[PDB]
Design an enzyme around this catalytic site. Sequence first.
Site, PDB file in Angstrom:
ATOM      1  N   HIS A   1       0.948  -1.209  -0.135  1.00 15.88           N
ATOM      2  CA  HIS A   1      -0.040  -0.112  -0.044  1.00 15.88           C
ATOM      3  C   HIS A   1       0.973   1.357  -0.024  1.00 15.88           C
ATOM      4  CE1 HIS A   1       0.501   0.187   4.631  1.00 15.88           C
ATOM      5  NE2 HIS A   1       0.486   1.287   4.346  1.00 15.88           N
TER       6      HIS A   1
ATOM      7  N   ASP B   1       0.065  -7.723   1.781  1.00 10.47           N
ATOM      8  CA  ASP B   1       0.625  -6.412   1.665  1.00 10.47           C
ATOM      9  C   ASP B   1       2.100  -6.122   1.859  1.00 10.47           C
ATOM     10  OD1 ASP B   1       0.299  -3.531   1.561  1.00 10.47           O
ATOM     11  OD2 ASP B   1      -0.380  -3.372   3.773  1.00 10.47           O
TER      12      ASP B   1
ATOM     13  N   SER C   1       3.949   2.570   8.405  1.00  6.53           N
ATOM     14  CA  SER C   1       3.450   1.743   7.424  1.00  6.53           C
ATOM     15  C   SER C   1       4.798   1.149   6.389  1.00  6.53           C
ATOM     16  CB  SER C   1       2.451   2.469   6.204  1.00  6.53           C
ATOM     17  OG  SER C   1       1.267   1.857   6.684  1.00  6.53           O
ATOM     18  N   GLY C   2       4.965  -0.045   6.525  1.00  7.40           N
ATOM     19  CA  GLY C   2       6.089  -0.405   5.942  1.00  7.40           C
ATOM     20  C   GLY C   2       7.211  -0.834   6.502  1.00  7.40           C
TER      21      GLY C   2
END
Length: 218
Positions: free
Chosen positions: A41, A88, A173-174
Site C-alpha cells: 500500500h 501487503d 507503514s512499511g
Amino acid sequence: IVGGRRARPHAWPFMVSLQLRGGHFCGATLIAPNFVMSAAHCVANVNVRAVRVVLGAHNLSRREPTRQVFAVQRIFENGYDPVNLLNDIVILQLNGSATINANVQVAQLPAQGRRLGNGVQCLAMGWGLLGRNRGIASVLQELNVTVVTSLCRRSNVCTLVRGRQAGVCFGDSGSPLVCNGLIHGIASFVRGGCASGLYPDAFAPVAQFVNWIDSIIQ
Ligand SMILES: *[C@@H]1O[C@H](CO[C@@H]2O[C@@H](C)[C@@H](O)[C@@H](O)[C@@H]2O)[C@@H](O[C@@H]2O[C@H](CO)[C@@H](O)[C@H](O)[C@H]2NC(C)=O)[C@H](O)[C@H]1NC(C)=O
C-alpha cells in the site's frame, strides 16, 4: 510510534525511510544491496519515479552524511489486495547498490512458513507520528511489543503492548517488525485508530513470502 523510545543512532542499519517531496511517509527494510522491502500500500498509487529511498538515516530533521539515497527502478508485488489488505508486501529494485558499512546493512529474514507463537517478544520501529499531537518523529523510534493471535488473522502477524496504549501510527507503514534478529513483519494496518489498546497492530507476515522474495533477489 506512539509510546516508544528513541532508538540508539544506527542501531538498526537496515532501517529505510521512503520519501516524497523530501518528506518521510513510509518505512522499508534493506534485504539486499539493491532491494528494499516495504508494504504494497505504500507504493500502490505514487509516482514511483518520484520516490527516494533513504538508507542509513537516524534523525530525519538534520543533514546526515551517513545517508545513501537511491531511486526505485522496478516494482515486484505478490497478489496484493487493497480491499482486505492481503499480501501487503512489495519489493523495490533500486537504481544501484548500497555500500555496506556501519550504518547500512542487509537484514536477516526467516525461513519460509515460520509462524510465531503468542507471547514472542519483538521490536517495532519507525519514524511515524508520536501520538498525542506531538507530530511526526524526528529520530527513529522503537517499541517493545508482544506477538498475539487474538483479533488477528492467520494471514498476518499481529502485536500488542499489554497494559497501555502504544503501537505503530501514521508513517510507520512499511516498517519492519524484528523478532529475535529476523524481520518477521511489515507494518500493514491498525484498528480503532492508533494505540487503541483494543486491537493489535497487524503486519504482513514476511515468512509467508520468503520463497517469492528469494526468486526476486537471488
Ligand atoms: C540513483 O538515484 C539517486 C536519486 O536521485 C534522483 O533519481 C535519479 C535517477 C536522478 O534523476 C536524480 O537527479 C534524482 O534526484 C541519484 O542521486 C542524485 O544524483 C545526482 C547526480 O549525481 C545528484 O546531482 C543528486 O544530488 C542526487 N540526488 C540525491 C537525492 O542524492 C543517483 O545519482 C542515481 N544513481 C544512478 C546510478 O543512477
